Design a protein around this ligand. Structure first.
Ligand SMILES: N[C@@H](CCO)C(=O)O
Ligand SMILES: N[C@@H](CCO)C(=O)O
Lengths: 268, 268
């Protein structure tokens, strides 16, 4: 043949796509570390991102009153050190309710992490949280529970994710809610990924955003306070806190945030 | 503050980057399946790709004589059903040597898969291959052996990859060669990822490109021939060949090919 065709994987043209507006509601004690972790994970996209930092009304950080008349493509509500309290006892609960209500109409997709996810599940869907006898603490194997869901694109069928919490939501309580879909659970750790209203809410009860040493630092922090805390599970080789942490969860941390931004925050 | 700054993750502008020239040398028996697997994995890049299909000189497919006076950014040399033979006994060995010599000067980065990797290791670096008593056959855990190497960017420290072979190269034989670096090995399966001359060659002795059912089909193919073949390891739940294959390796299949294209095939 005189003319032999080549197969061309076309250039992914994303340069004329509008920059996405993302807000981060930072509720974590380690404000710096949490922000840094999230900014790096949010970097996993070819699209341009305008990232607005928020915190509770209780100089880069804004409050809800500054954005209440605006719309966002994405919002991240982080975890918080308040899990043992009833939701209504948390000092900023009324303000958070305002933000969560706002997210329904003014945010395309809200990602909720750990307690933020518990708060969202409770406020939107009435899902209760329950105390654990000991901390769920370590890196755990999870299984994909739904095929063909964009949030899970490129995921292995079995993958690892960190959990760090003295409370839980229960699978049966998620299952009974029509508007929720369980995406990933762990035989040991329980519920991890849940989607609400086709992606209007994304709930991650585990800590996929944790970097290498986060569980180590939590372990040492608690140990030093005189708390009775076991070594994080599947994290130190031979359960030796002096060894380098084994990182089994970063690839799916990246995939979670990348798929969220590309398939849920962005809408064509 | 009157003006609150936002943090902007800049748009990744790749639209003005030249389309990369990739050639695939297809030596596999399952020509269609292998090509399809590779085309999908090569899709993991925002860059445009011009993919030229090659096969041995023994209507999309070209031969070496068509491209001998051209340069490529990337070349993939697949596996082949010839592993029990001494390299020089393979019918097209002299022609493959010509292609491998050509790759040194005319190809920025060549990725070699399974036997192709054995052939490349042998021709370029004198690394011998050795028979196994039984097929290395299944999905195996691997550990990252180098930090800060671009081919392994975003990899978990422990990750899974399929192997399917009745022969091996040995780690000690790779170790003694200065121009080679072991990137990933498996306690059970042995050598998987190796880099030659800072990325001029990439060797993948396992089969990261395998899709869901490939090991299943190989198992049934061999079984039907009357061969004595054990179930692929860590692949069927309860080692039951009727169960759906568990896919633990796709995420790092994607990462391997994505990092190869983005950091080795492409050069700024
Ligand atoms: N579990 C975290 C709180 C956020 O989940 C900690 O121990 O600091
Ligand atoms: N192991 C493959 C050959 C390519 O490695 C097979 O059994 O068909």
């Amino acid at each position: 043949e005189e003319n032999i065709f080549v197969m061309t994987k076309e250039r992914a043209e994303t340069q004329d796509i509008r920059a996405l507006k993302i807000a981060i509601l930072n509720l974590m004690p380690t404000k710096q570390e949490t922000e840094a972790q999230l900014l790096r994970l949010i970097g996993n996209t070819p699209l341009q991102l305008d990232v607005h930092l928020l915190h509770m009304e209780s100089s880069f950080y804004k409050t809800f009153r500054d954005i209440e008349n605006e719309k966002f493509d994405g919002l991240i509500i982080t975890g918080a050190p308040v899990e043992t309290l009833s939701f209504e006892e948390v000092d900023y609960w009324e303000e958070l309710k305002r933000i969560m209500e706002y997210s329904k109409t003014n945010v395309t997709s809200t990602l909720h992490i750990c307690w933020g996810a518990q708060a969202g599940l409770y406020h939107h869907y009435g899902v209760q949280k329950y105390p654990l006898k000991e901390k769920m603490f370590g890196v755990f194997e999870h299984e994909v529970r739904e095929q063909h869901v964009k949030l899970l694109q490129g995921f292995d069928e079995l993958f690892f994710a960190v959990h760090s919490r003295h409370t839980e939501v229960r699978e049966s309580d998620i299952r009974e809610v029509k508007e929720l879909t369980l995406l990933a659970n762990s035989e040991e750790a329980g519920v991890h990924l849940v989607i609400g209203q086709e992606g209007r809410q994304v709930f991650a009860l585990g800590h996929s955003e944790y970097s290498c040493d986060t569980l180590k630092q939590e372990y040492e922090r608690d140990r030093d306070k005189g708390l009775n805390i076991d070594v994080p599970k599947n994290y130190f080789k031979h359960d030796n806190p002096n060894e380098k942490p084994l990182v089994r969860w970063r690839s799916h941390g990246n995939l979670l945030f990348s798929n969220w931004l590309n398939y849920y925050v962005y809408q064509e």
